[PDB]
Amino acid sequence: IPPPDLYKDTPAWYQAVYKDNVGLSEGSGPFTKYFKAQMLDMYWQPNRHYEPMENLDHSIFIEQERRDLCVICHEEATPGIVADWRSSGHKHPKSTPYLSSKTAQIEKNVGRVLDEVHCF
Amino acid sequence: IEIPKEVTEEGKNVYKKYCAPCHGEEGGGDGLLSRSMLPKPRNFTLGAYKFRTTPSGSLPTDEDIYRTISYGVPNSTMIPWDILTEEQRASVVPVLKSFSEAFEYREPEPSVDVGLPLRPTERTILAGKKIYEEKLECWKCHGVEGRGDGPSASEQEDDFGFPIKPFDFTTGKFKGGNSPTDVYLRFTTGLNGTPMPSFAKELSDDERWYLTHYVMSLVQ
Amino acid sequence: IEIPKEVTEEGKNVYKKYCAPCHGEEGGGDGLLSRSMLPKPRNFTLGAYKFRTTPSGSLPTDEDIYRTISYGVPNSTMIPWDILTEEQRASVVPVLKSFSEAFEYREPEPSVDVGLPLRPTERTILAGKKIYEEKLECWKCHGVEGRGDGPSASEQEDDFGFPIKPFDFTTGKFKGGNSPTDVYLRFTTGLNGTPMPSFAKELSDDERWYLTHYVMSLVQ
Ligand code: HEC
Ligand code: HEC
Ligand code: HEC
Ligand code: HEC
């Protein structure tokens, strides 16, 4: 099954100006060369405009699959995000019959076991 | 393992890649992300370390620094660095030491002797409750239950000029470690750079175990 | 302080007045009150001490014995003897050693190195839960929650021939001490004379800290 693609059935010229990742160095659409994107377009339109972090390297936490360190640090760096995530169905996906049911079908579709959906 | 006295290129790089973003390029606790971080990352240039095995005012031993790096500091963004190798964590100890001239002129005082932890009883807890509430009035900063909501709590400040309001320790996540030996060490050594002093002189070894037992009693 | 190797008249008298009623006149664990006492008082003649800093099968160090005397053994009539002086508790160590020929022929093995206690996390607790329940099946003797009600619990026996049903440790009153270092020591040294073995060989240092973190999680 083809991976999810927001730009399915779109011509190559359309994906070249809307999906292909320029930085903040360019705009988007047919007039992409006439302006530059606003800073927050990193977050509003990530595929086209997101750029990697520049202050604290996150690679070592990804390279050794340290999902635990994501929580240990952001528990204190951004407590609000963790409080939301700990309270969401992604943290407790098998806590109700409804959640357990939808999670089971997702486990079959992705070929994996999902006891929680993590920041990773 | 063995912690070197010499500064190495590997030690520079490990600090650069894993410590500079918070503690600053020169250990001044002034990395870019320190502007929005609370608690603030340690300014190593003062030679003031909260968590030691040495008395109040002394430098930390090389083992004290390696321990804090490995274990991390709860209630802060200071994660454990067990993700790094034994040698990597040891090679950054002199880098942190090179940030303060105090390490080059004075030698760290001898480590204190913990002794044997006393057996907690109903008697020892009440003797610590008396010290905590009457003899030394710890509820001033920490509150009656240790919630960190005492009258003098909001006004406390670092020696770096930063607000240090005593965190709620009823969760049991002490910054220096949640062991009874760890808490006893804090009362015997004091936290350099903070208004939390050493009680090695005001109290005997037994009385600080009494006090430790009551502090652990306040945890949930 | 310094624990003597020589046996003194003071050491004889202190044992006579404060230890013989339970442990027996010759350290055989056969004082009169031992007939009705549970757990039974230690039979020192076997040279088997539950609580050491030495590996499994080794004798205790003189400091190991002095520590148990000072701290006592929870979940038993073995009270702390802090009521006695430093010298008094030290003078009975050789008296206890003289009860077993093993102390005269073999020397106690070197103390193990604790190392730095790892930071407890949600990750370390689940890795210990896996060891406790799958890799080593500790619920056999101790039960799923550590209540001491596992299938093999009632049938366990001492090397002295006495029933030793693992006590409920969810209260947190461990016999060797309730510290994370104390519990880690038990898993690294084993309890001589009991079916509770050493896991220094089955598990690494890190895995026994994982296991320790999960065991502490079972406390209330
Ligand atoms: C931002 C996520 C940080 C990173 C990256 C590093 N450290 Fe850190 N550190 C940080 C904070 C917010 C604090 C203060 C915590 C508190 O509440 O007191 C610290 C503290 C230390 C200390 C303090 C020792 C003491 O005061 O007794 C040490 C020795 C230390 N940090 C070392 C250290 C090393 C070696 C790092 C690179 C591996 C490192 N830190 C990164 C925040 C952050
Ligand atoms: C105001 C001068 C205080 C008095 C009086 C007492 N404490 Fe304190 N304490 C204070 C501060 C500013 C801090 C550091 C907080 C931080 O975020 O770094 C502390 C720290 C502690 C701790 C935590 C130890 C740890 O390892 O985390 C404990 C357990 C503690 N203090 C206990 C304590 C006791 C027993 C007191 C009476 C003898 C006492 N505090 C008084 C501020 C002040
Ligand atoms: C009856 C109230 C006792 C008195 C008097 C003394 N001891 Fe004891 N002791 C007692 C019991 C029931 C036990 C076993 C506890 C258990 O559940 O295992 C013990 C054990 C010891 C040990 C054990 C050390 C080990 O196994 O690792 C020691 C070294 C010991 N006791 C010493 C000791 C001394 C020096 C005493 C006189 C001051 C003494 N005991 C008195 C019960 C009783
Ligand atoms: C049957 C052979 C057991 C197996 C399997 C496990 N444990 Fe055990 N344990 C057993 C006994 C008979 C005792 C002594 C009880 C007494 O009254 O003396 C113990 C002791 C412990 C303790 C207590 C340590 C202390 O200082 O009090 C702990 C924390 C413990 N055991 C943990 C534990 C773990 C983690 C196990 C799986 C690796 C395990 N036990 C298996 C009997 C048996």
UniProtKB/TrEMBL annotation, chain A:
<protein>
    <submittedName>
        <fullName>Similar to hydroxylamine oxidoreductase</fullName>
    </submittedName>
</protein>
UniProtKB/TrEMBL annotation, chains B, C:
<feature type="binding site">
    <location>
        <position position="78"/>
    </location>
    <ligand>
        <name>heme c 1</name>
    </ligand>
</feature>
<dbReference type="GO" id="GO:0046872">
    <property type="term" value="F:metal ion binding"/>
</dbReference>
<feature type="binding site">
    <location>
        <position position="42"/>
    </location>
    <ligand>
        <name>heme c 1</name>
    </ligand>
</feature>
<keyword id="KW-0479">Metal-binding</keyword>
<feature type="domain" description="Cytochrome c">
    <location>
        <begin position="123"/>
        <end position="219"/>
    </location>
</feature>
<feature type="binding site">
    <location>
        <position position="23"/>
    </location>
    <ligand>
        <name>heme c 1</name>
    </ligand>
</feature>
<feature type="binding site">
    <location>
        <position position="175"/>
    </location>
    <ligand>
        <name>heme c 1</name>
    </ligand>
</feature>
<feature type="binding site">
    <location>
        <position position="51"/>
    </location>
    <ligand>
        <name>heme c 1</name>
    </ligand>
</feature>
<feature type="binding site">
    <location>
        <position position="19"/>
    </location>
    <ligand>
        <name>heme c 1</name>
    </ligand>
</feature>
<feature type="domain" description="Cytochrome c">
    <location>
        <begin position="6"/>
        <end position="100"/>
    </location>
</feature>
<keyword id="KW-0349">Heme</keyword>
<feature type="binding site">
    <location>
        <position position="50"/>
    </location>
    <ligand>
        <name>heme c 2</name>
    </ligand>
</feature>
<feature type="binding site">
    <location>
        <position position="22"/>
    </location>
    <ligand>
        <name>heme c 1</name>
    </ligand>
</feature>
<dbReference type="GO" id="GO:0044222">
    <property type="term" value="C:anammoxosome"/>
</dbReference>
<dbReference type="GO" id="GO:0020037">
    <property type="term" value="F:heme binding"/>
</dbReference>
<protein>
    <submittedName>
        <fullName>C-type diheme-containing protein</fullName>
    </submittedName>
</protein>
<dbReference type="GO" id="GO:0009055">
    <property type="term" value="F:electron transfer activity"/>
</dbReference>
<feature type="binding site">
    <location>
        <position position="50"/>
    </location>
    <ligand>
        <name>heme c 1</name>
    </ligand>
</feature>
<feature type="binding site">
    <location>
        <position position="175"/>
    </location>
    <ligand>
        <name>heme c 2</name>
    </ligand>
</feature>
<keyword id="KW-0732">Signal</keyword>
<keyword id="KW-0408">Iron</keyword>
<feature type="binding site">
    <location>
        <position position="176"/>
    </location>
    <ligand>
        <name>heme c 2</name>
    </ligand>
</feature>
